[PDB]
Amino acid sequence: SWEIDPKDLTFLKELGTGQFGVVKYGKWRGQYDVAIKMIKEGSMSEDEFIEEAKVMMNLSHEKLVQLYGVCTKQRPIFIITEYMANGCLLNYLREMRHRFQTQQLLEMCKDVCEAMEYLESKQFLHRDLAARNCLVNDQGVVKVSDFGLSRYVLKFPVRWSPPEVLMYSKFSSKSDIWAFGVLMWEIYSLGKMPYERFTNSETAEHIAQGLRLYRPHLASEKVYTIMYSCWHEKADERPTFKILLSNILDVMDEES
Numbered sequence: 001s002w003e004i005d006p007k008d009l010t011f012l013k014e015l016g017t018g019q020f021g022v023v024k025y026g027k028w029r030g031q032y033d034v035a036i037k038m039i040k041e042g043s044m045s046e047d048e049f050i051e052e053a054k055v056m057m058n059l060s061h062e063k064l065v066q067l068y069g070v071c072t073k074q075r076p077i078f079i080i081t082e083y084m085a086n087g088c089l090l091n092y093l094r095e096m097r098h099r100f101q102t103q104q105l106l107e108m109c110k111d112v113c114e115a116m117e118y119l120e121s122k123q124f125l126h127r128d129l130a131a132r133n134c135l136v137n138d139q140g141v142v143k144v145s146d147f148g149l150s151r152y153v154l155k156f157p158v159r160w161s162p163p164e165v166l167m168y169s170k171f172s173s174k175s176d177i178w179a180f181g182v183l184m185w186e187i188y189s190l191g192k193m194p195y196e197r198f199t200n201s202e203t204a205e206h207i208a209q210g211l212r213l214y215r216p217h218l219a220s221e222k223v224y225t226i227m228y229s230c231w232h233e234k235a236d237e238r239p240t241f242k243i244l245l246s247n248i249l250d251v252m253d254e255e256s
């Protein structure tokens with residue numbers, strides 16, 4: 001049920017190369033748009049991924065990039081997903097032509113928060129949430145991509161990691177919460193690199209001294225309060241995604 005026949009795939013355009021390999025646009029059975037992730041040989045714990053792919057295919061949410069299936073009876077193996085016409089969110093934010101209103105930026109945050117609240121309810125961690133791992137469809141909807149995929153990569157996201165990850169490798173729902181706050185910052189900074197004047201090593205040292213990302217000028221005071229709550233020193237004092245969604249909806253109503 002998780003296996004797609006590669007003979008049903010028509011490769012049409014190269015979209016670019018990502019963290020796991022080249023990505024191409026194509027058609028399934030000459031009809032349906034798909035993205036084809038070609039996993040470069042030797043780069044992935046493939047046996048482990050196949051078994052988790054069966055779990056990932058039961059995760060269905062409108063704001064999760066849908067896994068259609070995999071091709072593993074050959075090499076290199078393929079991951080077949082929903083095609084997102086406007087590409088990755090990081091590049092989308094950096095296209096200044098869009099001249100985003102802040103209501104649009106907030107809607108991007110809400111889209112991701114809904115997907116993350118869904119994964120939280122399923123006790124599934126993303127483990128590498130960032131704007132590079134979010135995608136935008138033709139209607140401008142943002143969806144979360146490649147959730148959990150870093151577990152099978154055989155360059156660590158320091159700038160999206162809370163102190164207990166940098167210090168102790170302590171992963172939890174709350175390290176996803178922290179990363180979400182950084183993602184809100186990426187969105188409202190129109191895709192700047194977090195801690196844009198620091199190296200990873202300096203970021204870690206400054207994070208330990210209590211430094212935090214400044215308020216992007218496009219975020220209102222209430223929006224900065226939301227992203228800032230994701231960065232509490234003590235992980236247990238960080239909200240859940242259900243709480244963040246209620247907070248995002250509250251601000252959306254106030255700034256409508």
Ligand SMILES: CCC(=O)N1CCC[C@@H](Oc2nc(-c3cnn(C)c3)cn3nccc23)CC1
Pocket residue numbers: 015016017018019023035081082083084085086087088089090091131132133135
């Ligand atoms: C931020 C990361 C990044 O830039 N890349 C390189 C490119 C491939 C990208 O993946 C997809 N890219 C597009 C796309 C790219 N350009 N246009 C017009 C659409 C669509 N879909 N639909 C499912 C997946 C992808 C991820 C990695």
